Design a protein around this ligand. Structure first.
Ligand SMILES: CCC(=O)N(C)CCOc1ccccc1Oc1cccn2cc(C#N)cc12
Ligand SMILES: [Mg+2]
Ligand SMILES: [Mg+2]
Ligand SMILES: [Mg+2]
Lengths: 552, 402
């Protein structure tokens, strides 16, 4: 049934005309199916036979996936030529953000698109043709009067129409919640299940008056609902079950689909990790290129299969209770969080394991995790949560104060659940008295890639180590590593490398580079370290001598 | 009553910018504001055949909520339109008047209205946004003051006639009114102009003093006893500053370090070394030689967290050729946290920048992007929005501007 809703005006992209895609010939079987479908659709006003003048065409086809037939049109050309529309909703509501309702009904709109009219001046550009037997005769000219399935504007214009159509009904029933999604409606209420069925029946007949057919009270989908990868029970939600494949070889494609399913599971499965797995895609040359699995990826995947063994569910949302988020460290770089209002009733879970830089530290990463949780809470619930964090005010205050970058720290309470989050070391702010002063330098032949790291101390010690296949930057770090290695528990280091200074002052506790991870181990073992910088090749003293040494 | 034809620059379509998500509190406020704006005909709802979008935000200028539209992308796409008073920066006082409400009495070219479309987002994708477009001249669109300009000249001509030495500059939704009068005479002159504006049906609700603000000169430490480390810092800082002031020398200062000395060893400041440093404090006093403002090139601002509520900034167009530098201080006053501080600093720099050159700078902000995208509106008061990007402050840039 075509609805008496107003039509949305539609224009072609300016300076383009309608598609003239000539129709491909069809088997007499398919031609018969189309003619009978098209007459039935003509009967219902969905399409109309058109004169000879309409110069447009779009190929048509007939199929019946191996009972009934369906008519399929290829609007690819017409789509390319028609104006853009306000993007139909992409994002979908997240089950953890639904409010518990006593009865929820699922209505499917039958032939949604065909129930809505297509504005008049645009109908000419939908013309299509049912081939004659073998071009023996001229074919049938038809054009659409409703939103064609597969045309670019149908999804947005349908949703717009549905929204307008709903308004008057929602007006007189502010006690009924209606979600609109594609050609579905999800109608919830806490009314007595009796008058709830009453209101559903009202809404169905309101939609029928506007041309929208709805399922009978005996065909309305029953719970728990299979919806967009989820299971929506009346009192809990969870994801639909995940099947991780077992393979001897893995292509870039198998891995991608695998990080996908694990990402999917992390919204309710606490503990999922995908860092070492997606490291495997850092090159990802081709979707077919086989990628050997590192040992760490193997253990990651094995641990995930263990978590998937147990079954898990999330709860729905209560606007009156608080919103709370806890974060636990979960290995190097990888973090896990839960959001809940009831101490063991999770709304949802998630991960954060982004380095977003070659080197980081734990406080930086936890602060980033708190950021992603904040963005996510706003999206799902329109507010930010309270945070319960395994880090003391002393730790965090010191960091965000000393941190050269601006940082927002929410209200949180310290939760003493090891592994706690701590600064593993801190450089000195002032040079150390009675500690040996090491003047370090590195140099590398930018062509041969051979190098040396050296030092000269104030106690008169000097040393040079040879380096192969290295860079001026890697040697500058190596010189610092050397001085750490050959010093006591307290040491002053003086470098001329802004690169090396920049890395160390940042105070990382984890790195992609093994050398930087080695320096980090030294730094922890040390009791006091002061790092200082001087401009190079300015004959300062200490720096000049170790430059002379290493540059020889 | 009659509208003014408006067009986009050739070969450009309108904006399609994402709507950031908002707290239920801010969405609630935007629906209230927009419901009344529609009642008064200032905006109307729109259909799916409008693909355009500009972000909207809820801020506070007071305890009632205000609505801010980020027309940065539309402004880039309409700059087609139509001397900035260099004396404004000189005046003893400058007061800023929000005259943005003038715009809402003016029809906007019906063919251009679609380009101003915007969305009020929902929570958790429950509904698609509520979608509106503008029927009148909107605040924040750079076409609005251009269209209204003739009306503004008309309403101001009397007042300028009475007060020939008072400078009135318009930028976006604000009038900058600058005098050399005594403050009480200044604020009276402002009140007259407010009264004159109001009684001609142009509603209006911040005073600056551009004669005082100076470009900071480099400051070298003054110590009783100097260690090796102190002389190294001094030599490094002075080495940095000599990319800017040619005349700086370090020969005598670094000589004091010849050898291979412990860092904490006290070095007396010999006579020649003290002379060199005293001369260098003198060189750092004067201004740089050939640094001039090219109005075609963009202004860039950089900001450094100095700790204890302090922030240094530089505005420049070519690296190391600073048009202005400054340092902002913040009183802890309960919260005054890092983002509140950076956000206020950005507004002060932009204001200063508007006063001096008439354009806003492009900011290099020391903050994680998402953190900024999340909280910048909790403290934003201006009605304009500069461009910005996100960076990682270098190690020594901080201490050298301290
Ligand atoms: C409490 C009990 C429950 O069962 N759900 C699910 C949460 C109740 O939230 C609702 C509220 C109003 C209307 C419908 C609701 O349900 C859905 C919301 C959003 C998307 N939906 C998709 C389906 C399907 N297939 C059902 C829903
Ligand atoms: Mg919801
Ligand atoms: Mg990363
Ligand atoms: Mg060197």
């Amino acid at each position: 049934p075509i609805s008496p809703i107003e039509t949305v005006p539609v224009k072609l992209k300016p300076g383009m005309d309608g598609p003239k895609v000539k129709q491909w010939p069809l088997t007499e079987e398919k031609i018969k199916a189309l003619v009978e479908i098209c007459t039935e659709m003509e009967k219902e006003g969905k399409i109309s036979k058109i004169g000879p003048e309409n110069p447009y065409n779009t190929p048509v086809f007939a199929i019946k996936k191996k009972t009934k037939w369906r008519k399929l049109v290829d609007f690819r050309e017409l789509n390319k030529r028609t104006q853009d529309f306000w993007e139909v909703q992409l994002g979908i509501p997240h089950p953890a953000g639904l409010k518990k309702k006593k009865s929820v009904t699922v209505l499917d709109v039958g032939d949604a698109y065909f129930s809505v009219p297509l504005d008049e001046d645009f109908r000419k550009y939908t013309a299509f043709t049912i081939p004659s037997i073998n071009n023996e005769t001229p074919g049938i000219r038809y054009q659409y009067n409703v939103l064609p399935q597969g045309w670019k504007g149908s999804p947005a214009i349908f949703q717009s129409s549905m929204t307008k159509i709903l308004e008057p009904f929602a007006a007189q029933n502010p006690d009924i919640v209606i979600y609109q999604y594609m050609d579905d409606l999800y109608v919830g209420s806490d009314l007595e299940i009796g008058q709830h069925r009453t209101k559903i029946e009202e809404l169905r007949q309101h939609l029928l008056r506007w041309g929208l057919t709805t399922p009978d009270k005996k065909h309305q989908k029953e719970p728990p609902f299979l919806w967009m990868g989820y299971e929506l029970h009346p009192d809990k939600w969870t994801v639909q079950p995940i099947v991780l494949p077992e393979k001897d070889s893995w292509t870039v494609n198998d891995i991608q689909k695998l990080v996908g399913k694990l990402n999917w599971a992390s919204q309710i499965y606490p503990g999922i990790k995908v860092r070492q797995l997606s490291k495997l895609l850092r090159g990802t040359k081709a979707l077919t290129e086989v990628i050997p699995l590192t040992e760490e990826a193997e253990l990651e995947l094995a641990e995930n299969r263990e978590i998937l063994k147990e079954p898990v569910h999330g709860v729905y949302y209560d606007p009156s209770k608080d919103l709370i988020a806890e974060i636990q460290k979960q290995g190097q770089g990888q973090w896990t969080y839960q959001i809940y209002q009831e101490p063991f009733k999770n709304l949802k879970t998630g991960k954060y394991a982004r380095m977003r830089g070659a080197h980081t530290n734990d406080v930086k990463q936890l602060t980033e995790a708190v950021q992603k949780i904040t963005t996510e809470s706003i999206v799902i619930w329109g507010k930010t949560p309270k945070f319960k964090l395994p880090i003391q005010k002393e730790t965090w205050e010191t960091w965000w104060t000393e941190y050269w970058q601006a940082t927002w720290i929410p209200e949180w309470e310290f939760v003493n659940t090891p592994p706690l989050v701590k600064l593993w070391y801190q450089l000195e702010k002032e040079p150390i008295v009675g500690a040996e002063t090491f003047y370090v330098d590195g140099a590398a032949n930018r062509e041969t890639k051979l190098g040396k790291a050296g030092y000269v101390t104030n106690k008169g010690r000097q040393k040079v180590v040879p380096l192969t296949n290295t860079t001026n930057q890697k040697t500058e770090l190596q010189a610092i590593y050397l001085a750490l290695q050959d010093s006591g528990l307290e040491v002053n280091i003086v470098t001329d490398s802004q690169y090396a200074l920049g890395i160390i002052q940042a105070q990382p506790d984890k790195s992609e580079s093994e050398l930087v991870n080695q320096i980090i181990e030294q730094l922890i073992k040390k009791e006091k370290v002061y790092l200082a910088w001087v401009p190079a090749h300015k004959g300062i003293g200490g720096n000049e001598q170790v430059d002379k040494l290493v540059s020889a | 009553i009659e509208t003014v034809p408006v067009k986009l620059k050739p070969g450009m379509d309108g904006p399609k910018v994402k709507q950031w998500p908002l707290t239920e509190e801010k969405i609630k406020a935007l629906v209230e504001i927009c419901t009344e704006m529609e009642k008064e005909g200032k905006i109307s709802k729109i259909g799916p055949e409008n693909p355009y979008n500009t972000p909207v935000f809820a801020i506070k200028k007071s305890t009632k909520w205000r609505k801010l539209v980020d027309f940065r992308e539309l402004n880039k796409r309409t700059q087609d339109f139509w001397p900035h008073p260099a004396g404004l920066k000189k005046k003893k006082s400058v007061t800023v008047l929000d005259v943005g409400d003038a715009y809402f009495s003016v029809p906007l070219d019906e063919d251009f209205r679609k380009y101003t479309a915007f969305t009020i987002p929902s929570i958790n994708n429950e509904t698609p946004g509520i979608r509106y477009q503008y029927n009148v001249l909107p605040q924040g669109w750079k076409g609005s003051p251009a269209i209204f300009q003739s009306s503004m000249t008309k309403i101001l001509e009397p007042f300028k006639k009475q007060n020939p030495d008072i400078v009135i500059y318009q930028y976006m939704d604000d009038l900058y009114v600058g005098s050399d009068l005594e403050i009480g005479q200044h604020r009276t002159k402002i009140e007259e102009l407010r009264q004159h504006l109001l009684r001609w049906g142009l509603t209006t609700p911040y005073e600056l003093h551009p004669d005082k603000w100076t470009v900071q000169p480099i400051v070298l430490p003054e110590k009783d006893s100097w260690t090796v480390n102190d002389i190294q810092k001094l030599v490094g800082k002075l080495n940095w500053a000599s990319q800017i002031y040619p005349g700086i020398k370090v020969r005598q200062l670094s000589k004091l370090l010849r050898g291979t000395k412990a860092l904490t060893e006290v070095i007396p400041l010999t006579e020649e070394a003290e002379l060199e440093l005293a001369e260098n404090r003198e060189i750092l006093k004067e201004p740089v030689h050939g640094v001039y403002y090219d109005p075609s090139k963009d202004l860039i601002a950089e900001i450094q967290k100095q700790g204890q509520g302090q922030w240094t900034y530089q505005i420049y167009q070519e690296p190391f050729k600073n048009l202005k530098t400054g340092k902002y201080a913040r009183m802890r006053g309960a919260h005054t946290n890092d983002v509140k501080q950076l956000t206020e600093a950005v507004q002060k720099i932009t204001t200063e920048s508007i006063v001096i050159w008439g354009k806003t700078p492009k900011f290099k902000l020391p903050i994680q992007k998402e953190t900024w995208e999340t909280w910048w509106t909790e403290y934003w008061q201006a009605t304009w929005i500069p461009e910005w990007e996100f960076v990682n402050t270098p190690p020594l840039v901080k201490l050298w501007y301290q």
